[PDB]
Design an enzyme around this catalytic site. Structure first.
Site, mmCIF file in Angstrom:
data_model
loop_
_atom_site.group_PDB
_atom_site.id
_atom_site.type_symbol
_atom_site.label_atom_id
_atom_site.label_comp_id
_atom_site.label_asym_id
_atom_site.label_seq_id
_atom_site.Cartn_x
_atom_site.Cartn_y
_atom_site.Cartn_z
ATOM 1 N N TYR A 113 10.503 10.860 -9.257
ATOM 2 C CA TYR A 113 10.908 9.465 -9.316
ATOM 3 C C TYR A 113 10.385 8.798 -10.563
ATOM 4 C CZ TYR A 113 6.082 8.193 -8.098
ATOM 5 O OH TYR A 113 4.709 8.082 -8.082
ATOM 6 N N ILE A 150 5.345 2.594 0.392
ATOM 7 C CA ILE A 150 5.968 1.299 0.637
ATOM 8 C C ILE A 150 7.195 1.446 1.548
ATOM 9 C CG2 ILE A 150 5.068 0.050 -1.338
ATOM 10 C CD1 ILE A 150 7.733 0.722 -2.803
ATOM 11 N N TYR A 169 5.201 -4.406 -2.573
ATOM 12 C CA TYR A 169 3.788 -4.830 -2.606
ATOM 13 C C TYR A 169 3.592 -6.302 -2.353
ATOM 14 C CZ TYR A 169 3.419 -0.183 -4.506
ATOM 15 O OH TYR A 169 3.559 1.148 -4.727
ATOM 16 N N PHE A 181 13.697 1.855 -8.350
ATOM 17 C CA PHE A 181 13.331 3.268 -8.468
ATOM 18 C C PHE A 181 14.588 4.110 -8.593
ATOM 19 C CE2 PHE A 181 8.821 3.506 -7.454
ATOM 20 C CZ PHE A 181 8.570 2.361 -6.746
ATOM 21 N N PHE A 215 6.535 1.479 -14.524
ATOM 22 C CA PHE A 215 5.201 1.379 -13.965
ATOM 23 C C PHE A 215 4.699 2.644 -13.319
ATOM 24 C CE2 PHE A 215 7.931 -0.363 -10.573
ATOM 25 C CZ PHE A 215 7.584 0.465 -9.516
ATOM 26 N N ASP A 216 5.545 3.621 -13.034
ATOM 27 C CA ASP A 216 5.081 4.822 -12.362
ATOM 28 C C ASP A 216 6.178 5.887 -12.581
ATOM 29 O OD1 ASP A 216 3.250 6.311 -10.760
ATOM 30 O OD2 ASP A 216 4.155 5.594 -8.888
#
Ligand SMILES: [Cl-]
Length: 122
Positions: free
Chosen positions: A42, A72, A98, A115, A52-53
């Protein structure tokens, strides 16, 4: 219901929770179901485009118990129904992300998260 919410190609799905998703590629393999340990690659971005990730950047897929409360809410909901080989774009409102807290010094309060998730194994 309504027409416009289904997106430019009539392929955006909105669920009862307010999650939206779109199948970019439909997988040919087995279906992801709650209770399975699934493995994904992902990337996540904020709505300004900031990454961010990413598991891809760590070169290591991520495995979790789908539906198990270990990620999440928008992931536990949004990965269900994918098939192995599929790529799904999740648009996760902050109450399924979040929330007011944010996370990690990198997700602000009240952030919508985008995502792209590739289902690798179930
Ligand atoms: Cl949206």
């Amino acid at each position: 219901s309504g027409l416009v919410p289904r997106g430019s190609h009539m392929t955006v799905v909105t669920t009862e929770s307010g999650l939206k998703y779109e199948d970019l590629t439909e997988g040919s393999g087995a279906e992801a179901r709650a209770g399975q340990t699934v493995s994904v690659h992902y990337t996540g971005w904020l709505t300004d485009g900031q990454k961010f990730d990413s598991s891809k950047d760590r070169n290591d897929p991520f495995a979790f118990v789908l539906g198990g409360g270990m990620v999440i809410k928008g992931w536990d909901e949004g990965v269900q129904g994918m098939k192995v080989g599929g790529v799904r774009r999740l648009t996760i409102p902050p109450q399924l992300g979040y929330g007011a807290r944010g996370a990690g010094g990198v997700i602000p309060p009240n952030a919508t998260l985008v995502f792209e998730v590739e289902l690798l194994d179930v």
